[PDB]
Amino acid sequence: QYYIDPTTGQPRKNFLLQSGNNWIYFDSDTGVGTNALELQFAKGTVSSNEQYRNGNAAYSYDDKSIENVNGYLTADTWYRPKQILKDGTTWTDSKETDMRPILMVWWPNTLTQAYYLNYMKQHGNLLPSALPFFNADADPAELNHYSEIVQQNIEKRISETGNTDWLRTLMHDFVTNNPMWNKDSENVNFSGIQFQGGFLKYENSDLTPYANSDYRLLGRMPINIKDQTYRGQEFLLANDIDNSNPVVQAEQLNWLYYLLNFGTITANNDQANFDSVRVDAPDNIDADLMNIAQDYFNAAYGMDSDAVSNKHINILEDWNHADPEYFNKIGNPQLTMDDTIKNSLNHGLSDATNRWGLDAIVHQSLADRENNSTENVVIPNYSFVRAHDNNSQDQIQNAIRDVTGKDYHTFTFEDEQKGIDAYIQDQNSTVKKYNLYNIPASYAILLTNKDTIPRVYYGDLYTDGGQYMEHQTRYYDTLTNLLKSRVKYVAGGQSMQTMSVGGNNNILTSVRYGKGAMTATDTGTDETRTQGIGVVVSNTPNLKLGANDKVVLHMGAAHKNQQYRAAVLTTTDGVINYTSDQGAPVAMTDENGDLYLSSHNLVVNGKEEADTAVQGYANPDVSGYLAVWVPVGASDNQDARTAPSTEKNSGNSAYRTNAAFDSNVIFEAFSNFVYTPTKESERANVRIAQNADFFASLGFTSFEMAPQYNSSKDRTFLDSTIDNGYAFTDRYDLGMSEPNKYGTDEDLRNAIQALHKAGLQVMADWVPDQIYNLPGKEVATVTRVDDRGNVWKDAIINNNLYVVNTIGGGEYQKKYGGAFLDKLQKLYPEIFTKKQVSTGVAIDPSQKITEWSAKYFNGTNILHRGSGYVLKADGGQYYNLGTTTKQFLPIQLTGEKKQGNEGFVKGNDGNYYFYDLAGNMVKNTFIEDSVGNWYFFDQDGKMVENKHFVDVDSYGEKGTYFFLKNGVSFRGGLVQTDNGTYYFDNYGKMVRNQTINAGAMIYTLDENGKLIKASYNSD
């Protein structure tokens, strides 16, 4: 029963002996000999490979174990396995911190698993560099083989470095490479208003009850409230706030109260409150918010008196041409802009080529100013030449783009400064490429215009770049003079005329009569004789008046035989200004009251009179001609402005367009490209407080401030790169958590208070459209759309699940969110009862928005996460922990394969086959079982049981093996045949041409495998 070794004396353990026709194998434990021909194949034998199924399965189904968003799984998912291959060798029970990538064990298809291996080989070095790339034809079992080795190598590197930080860098880099999980499947398009690459629209679904909303009305601009006309562009930037939702509508009213009472809310201050608001993107939001803002302003401020209304002058950013109508119909709660004068001035004077006829300035506007002598007749409006977002934002950016070649997507301060340098040099040039022509000429018309409030842009007084008021522009001296002249002289009716002498409808005459006179035939009151103004402007630099042609300033019957001094004159190099009466060239009117100018110079008692002749000029200041004439003998303290009436208005409008309305001037007190201060003294709001009286000196009554909200600094759009204040995370944060680009909340309060003491209004930039960069993640059902909201051409993210950044808001959003709705409902109950048009129902204060979510948003900008970023199964079923939808996880995390496969299977005639964890028939591979037996499967996957010396190639293992009739490869022992005794090492490989030391014995072997000499040796 036992073979006992002659040399050692011990019974032979693990020994095979041939005796004629019989083969006897001796036991490895004791040495009991049984017939090797009758060796049984194990009945319920399982592979050591199935130890992975036990370990790689998830620890549990909790937030702690498996990382999840809203319930679902993502491509960048770490999970907690049951066991860890510590150093890629030993299975160990996982701790709470042991987190592994889901893509290490799971793949959506075999193709991406092949792409996984190729990426982890090249960029990861977790596979041999000599190993070839895996194609689409690669064997699924072979792909499973190498991917399992990658796990071993991953765990090896973790045991060496002690980090998992390199993994999150490597796995995220892999995710972004596939067209499944990046911007490739996003349909990235920059059509029109799609600044950030396009938009995704949130939709109601069973899969995401969080994303559900009964409202979400799109394109509800002022013209399209009732949805009667065409719907506008609802989506603009970042996370588009749903303003159809009455819960949000109440929150917007709550936020409006916060801005209008800021000083009281934060520091119990009285004079540190905003008096008016600027509606940011009115044509992009649900225009219900206009009526809500109207309802509050009529109830809290009670705007039915000219004296009360003109102390709170609200304005709109309505670029729509049909908007002045609607806002006039609803009673002008906020002032509509006059885009028509802007077009008439820009295309008439500012254009580089093919200027408009200057008839446009006269006729094309909300007020025809040819013979305007009537009051309270036109739509109350504000007008401007340039703004922060208009006629600058794109040009300045182009200057940076030309000098350095960079977008707002990374340029640094240095490259921003280089662009500004080129922009200001261009500004101070005769031929301009980025700057508008005839700025002083444009402003000379604007500030002398009747039936409109003018708005002076910051970038026209101070440089668009630099620190706040660090540098003054070229046009500073002229505009400041014109603004001071407006206070003294500009009043009464207006008269305008055009000549066709040089070009076609060039050369314009602009005349104001002064307080007391409306028409030309009006003789005027007492004050009229020194009031009024005369402006001559031409747009052609080629202008050469005829020897007989004369330009006439018809000052009217009020100014018969008066003396007029020069205020602004055009020279060959630039312009000359005169602030006082002394030093200025003088001109006289006739019996009719006409100031004659011609091709020849003016003459007083035999004098040349400086530069007084009307002719075409070409210099950095004027590309045409400019002249401003002013009556002499004016008081030092003269004020042409008329006081607002305290009478109750019988009409149904918030603002009347009288002369007292014309007394106001708005200052847009910022450019988008102001530099972020380094010193405390370089802060914008500190300097506004210091120069508070100076802003009154120019005649500014309404002071439009920059949006004081803290920037997101995400560099997704321009508003977050230079930090305007239009790109914010926290709506209620006004330099409170950290100082913004303009200063702290204390600096802001000081600025507002100083302006109130100087006798000015202060405007809050109300931005109810979007919220930038939110910290929390959420899964919502989306649809790829355009700016208006229409489904994209061939949208591949149509009704797909997507991870969006909607959760968040900030500290002060959580503090003041809906915190004033309780007081507002008690104070003014009429606001909360009024049924909103478009919504159908009134605003809803019952829910306070302290934290934002997908419910309160209409949509989002494209996020480049991928259309298949939310993990779904092979046949299209989204993986979930059971929170939102039915619990479903992959076969890897549960850890139980079931089909006609896995482990060892006997298939009728085909002997024994092996199927791996996935269920693929394995060929040319050695498979070790749970106990420690290696079985080989040939080129057909059939188990070998020959008992003959068979050569195997396998996975780079060139060697000769021996297979018993049970299926096990013989290893670590001797086989005695009729040809001699043969030895096989611990791996089943036959030892040849070597003297080896096995146990207590030493075996010498030749090039045939036969034993030469077996000897015992100790010590």
Instruction: List contacts with Ca ion (CB under 5 A).
Output: 234, 240, 284-285, 769
Q: Select 289 or 439, whichever has its Cβ closest to Ca ion.
A: 289
**Half-sphere exposure at residue 870, Cβ-oriented, CA atoms within 13 angstroms:** 25
CA dihedral 178, 179, 181, 185 (to 10 degrees): 170
Question: Rg of the chain over CA atoms, in angstroms?
Answer: 42
Plot region of 343 (φ>0 → left; ψ -120 to 50 → alpha; else → beta) = alpha
Q: How far is the CB of 831 from Ca ion (least distance, A)?
A: 22
Q: Select 541 or 768, whichever has its Cβ closest to Ca ion.
A: 768
> Which residue type is seen at 678?
T
CA-nearest of 834, 666, 848, 854 to 765 is 666
Q: How far is the CB of 763 from Ca ion (least distance, A)?
A: 21
Q: Select 79 or 326, whichever has its Cβ closest to Ca ion.
A: 326
Q: Is 280 annotated among the ligand-binding residues? A: no
Q: How far is the CB of 774 from Ca ion (least distance, A)?
A: 16
Q: Select 288 or 464, whichever has its Cβ closest to Ca ion.
A: 288
Q: Select 668 or 769, whichever has its Cβ closest to Ca ion.
A: 769
Determine the Cα–Cα distance for residues 213 and 245; give it in Å rounded to an integer.
Answer: 8
Sequence-distant (≥ 6) Cβ neighbours of residue 244 within 8 angstroms: 215, 216, 217, 220, 286, 288, 838, 839, 858
Q: How far is the CB of 493 from Ca ion (least distance, A)?
A: 42
Q: Write out the H or E segment, with its range, that includes residue 253.
A: helix 246-260
Distance spanning both ends of the chain, measured CA to CA = 32
Determine the Cα–Cα distance for residues 347 and 352; give it in Å rounded to an integer.
Answer: 9
Q: How far is the CB of 148 from Ca ion (least distance, A)?
A: 51
Q: How far is the CB of 198 from Ca ion (least distance, A)?
A: 15
Q: How far is the CB of 220 from Ca ion (least distance, A)?
A: 9
Q: Is 769 annotated among the ligand-binding residues? A: yes
Q: Select 277 or 487, whichever has its Cβ closest to Ca ion.
A: 277
Q: How far is the CB of 527 from Ca ion (least distance, A)?
A: 49
Determine the Cα–Cα distance for residues 607 and 183; give it in Å rounded to an integer.
Answer: 74
Q: How far is the CB of 769 from Ca ion (least distance, A)?
A: 5
Backbone angles phi, psi at 977, to 5 degrees: -115, -170
CA-nearest of 367, 305, 311, 357 to 336 is 367
By beta carbon distance, the residue nearest Ca ion is 285
Where are the strands (E) in 555-662, listed by range? 563-570, 575-577, 586-588, 594-598, 625-631
Q: Select 240 or 611, whichever has its Cβ closest to Ca ion.
A: 240
Taking CA atoms, 354 is separated from 357, 426, 506, 899, 906, in Å, by 9, 20, 12, 79, 89
Determine the Cα–Cα distance for residues 806 and 855; give it in Å rounded to an integer.
Answer: 9
Q: How far is the CB of 234 from Ca ion (least distance, A)?
A: 5
> Which residue type is seen at 183?
K
Q: Percent helix, strand, coil in the chain (nearest 5)?
A: 25, 20, 55
Determine the Cα–Cα distance for residues 798 and 141; give it in Å rounded to an integer.
Answer: 35
Buried b (16+ CB within 10 A) or exposed e, 356-365: bbbbbbbebb
Classify 954 as helix, strand or coil.
coil
Q: How far is the CB of 670 from Ca ion (least distance, A)?
A: 23
Classify 503 as helix, strand or coil.
coil
CA-nearest of 476, 442, 440 to 461 is 476
Q: Select 234 or 251, whichever has its Cβ closest to Ca ion.
A: 234
Q: Select 389 or 415, whichever has its Cβ closest to Ca ion.
A: 389
Q: Select 114 or 780, whichever has its Cβ closest to Ca ion.
A: 780
Q: How far is the CB of 235 from Ca ion (least distance, A)?
A: 7
- Please state whether beta strands 934-937 and 925-928 pair in parallel, antiparallel, or not at all (unpaired): antiparallel
Q: Select 187 or 284, whichever has its Cβ closest to Ca ion.
A: 284
CB-based contact 312:332 (threshold 8 Å): no
Q: How many Cβ atoms sit within 10 Å of the Cβ of residue 622?
A: 28
Q: How far is the CB of 724 from Ca ion (least distance, A)?
A: 18
Determine the Cα–Cα distance for residues 985 and 997; give it in Å rounded to an integer.
Answer: 11
Q: How far is the CB of 218 from Ca ion (least distance, A)?
A: 8
Q: Select 284 or 364, whichever has its Cβ closest to Ca ion.
A: 284
Q: How far is the CB of 455 from Ca ion (least distance, A)?
A: 24
CB-based contact 565:581 (threshold 8 Å): yes
Q: Select 234 or 719, whichever has its Cβ closest to Ca ion.
A: 234
Q: Is 49 annotated among the ligand-binding residues? A: no
Q: Is 375 annotated among the ligand-binding residues? A: no
Q: Please, which residues bridge with residue 857 across strands?
A: 241
Sequence-distant (≥ 6) Cβ neighbours of residue 345 within 8 angstroms: 361, 385, 442, 445, 446
CB-based contact 934:988 (threshold 8 Å): yes
Q: Select 5 or 389, whichever has its Cβ closest to Ca ion.
A: 389
Taking CA atoms, 638 is separated from 59, 452, 469, 668, in Å, by 85, 21, 28, 26
Tokens of 719: 């508003």
CB-based contact 75:879 (threshold 8 Å): no
> Which residue type is seen at 787?
D
Q: Select 101 or 725, whichever has its Cβ closest to Ca ion.
A: 725
**Half-sphere exposure at residue 633, Cβ-oriented, CA atoms within 13 angstroms:** 8
CB-based contact 494:591 (threshold 8 Å): no
- Please state whether beta strands 315-316 and 276-279 pair in parallel, antiparallel, or not at all (unpaired): parallel
Q: Write out the H or E segment, with its range, that includes residue 446.
A: helix 439-446
Give binding residues as ranges: 234, 240, 284, 769
Please state the residue numbers annotated as binding site for Ca(2+): 234, 240, 284, 769
